[PDB]
Structure 1
Amino acid sequence: ELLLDSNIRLWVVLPIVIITFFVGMIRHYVSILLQSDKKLTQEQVSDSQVLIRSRVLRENGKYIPKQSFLTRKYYFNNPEDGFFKKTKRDPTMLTDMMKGNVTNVLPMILIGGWINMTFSGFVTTKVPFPLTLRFKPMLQQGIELLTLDASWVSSASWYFLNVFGLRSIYSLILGQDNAADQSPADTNKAFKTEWEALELTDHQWALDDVEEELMAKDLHFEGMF
């Protein structure tokens, strides 16, 4: 094998892991700090909630009798009722959203570049599987060796492996669906597509056969205590 310097472990192996871990935590906390809810006026939230009600009705109107459902239909999509017909209406926001989208990966690549400069010229760890020789130019940046086994990796790619393999740990400790990783706008068209979709939808009163499917088996009663 290779008699690697022990001091490479205490200052190039562990610090990379610590930096990656706490930079991920920093990124997640900065992401939650930056997020601010955009101000919404009454009309937009009102129409969003209205289409929410329409979609949930389309989903589970089976538990509602037929006359109530077709009255819903009359109210939603019918000339005479009027609803769904008489219901319609470098920039800072683009720069802000582009910067927010950029800040999810670019800080990782900048940290990688800084690590590649700072820790250039080492052999940090041996990747325990035989990587291909054609992968040499990116795993072993800063090394002039030629016959060195491809399984030996410099600092930058070791940090990259660390940042790829630590997202699951982030989900483990930080919380479910954390933001530390590496990876309606228009209502008129929404109104029209809801119109067409709920026109295409049908009715099936799920209570037409509940009694017969209930009469078949006795009612569970144990555990009353």
Structure 2
Amino acid sequence: ELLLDSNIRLWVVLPIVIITFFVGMIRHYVSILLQSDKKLTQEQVSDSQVLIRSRVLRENGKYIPKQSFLTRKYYFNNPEDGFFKKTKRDPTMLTDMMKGNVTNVLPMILIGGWINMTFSGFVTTKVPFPLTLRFKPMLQQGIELLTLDASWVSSASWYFLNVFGLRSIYSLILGQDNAADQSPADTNKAFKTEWEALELTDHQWALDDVEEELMAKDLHFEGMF
């Protein structure tokens, strides 16, 4: 094998892991710190909640008798009622959203480049599986060897593997669905599509057969204590 310098472990292997871990934490914390809710007026939240109610009605009107459901239908999408008809109305925001979307991967690539410069010329670890030779130019950046096994990796690709393998850990410790990783606007069209969808929907009162399906079995009663 190869008698690698022990100091390469104490100053090039572990620091990379620590950097990746804390950079992920930093990135997640900066993401949550930067996020500020945009102010919403009454109309937008009102229409969003109205279409929410309409959709949940479409979803589960089955537990509601037919007349209540078709009265709901009349109220929402029907000329006479009026509802769903008389219900309608470098930029800073684009730059901000583009920067926010960019800051999820670009900092990682910049850190990788900085590491590649800072830690150029080493052999950090041997990958325990026989990688292909064609992957040599990128795994062994900063190494002048020619016949070296492809399983030996430079600092940059080791950092890349580290950053690839730590997202699950981030979700494990930081919390579920953390932001440290690598990866309605229009109501008129929404109104019309809700109109069409709830027009297409039908009714099936799920209570039409609850009694018969209840009479079959006795009521659970144990554990009353």
TM-score when normalising by structure 2: 1.00
Segments of 4+ moved more than 4 angstroms: none
Cα distance per residue 1:55-97 (max 9 Å; x no partner): 1000100000000000000000100000000000000000000
Over residues 142-161 of structure 1, what are the superposed CA-to-partner deviations in whole Å (9 max), with x where a residue is unaligned?
00000000000000000000
1:218 Cα deviation (Å)?
0.3
Taking structure 1 as the reference length, what is the TM-score of the superposition? 1.00
Q: 1:162-191: CA deviations, max 9, x gaps?
A: 000000000000000000001111000000
Matched, 1:66 2:66: yes
**For residues 34 and 76 of structure 1, what CA distance do their matches in structure 2 show?**
39
Q: Which structure 1 residue ranges, 5 or more long, are not aligned?
A: none
Per-residue CA deviation, residues 179-209 of structure 1 (Å, 9 max, x unaligned), is 0001111000000000000000000000000
**Per-residue deviation, 1:40:** 0.2
* Separation of aligned partners in 1, 2:124 and 2:115: 12
In the TM superposition, what whole-angstrom CA distance separates every residue of 1:40-67 from its partner, at most 9, and x where no partner exists? Answer: 0000000000000001000100000000
Q: Distance in 1 between matches of 2:152 and 2:54?
A: 59
C-alpha separation in 1, matches of 2:189 and 2:210: 38
- Return the alpha-carbon distance in structure 2 between the equivalents of residues 2 and 54 of structure 1: 69
Unaligned runs of 5+ in 2: none
Aligned to 1:149: 149
Q: Deviations over 1:19-43 (max 9, x none)?
A: 0000000000000000000000000
Aligned positions, number: 225
Could you give the per-residue CA deviations for residues 91-110 of structure 1, whole angstroms, max 9, x where no partner exists?
A: 00000000000000000000
Q: 1:110-144: CA deviations, max 9, x gaps?
A: 00000000000000001111000000000000000
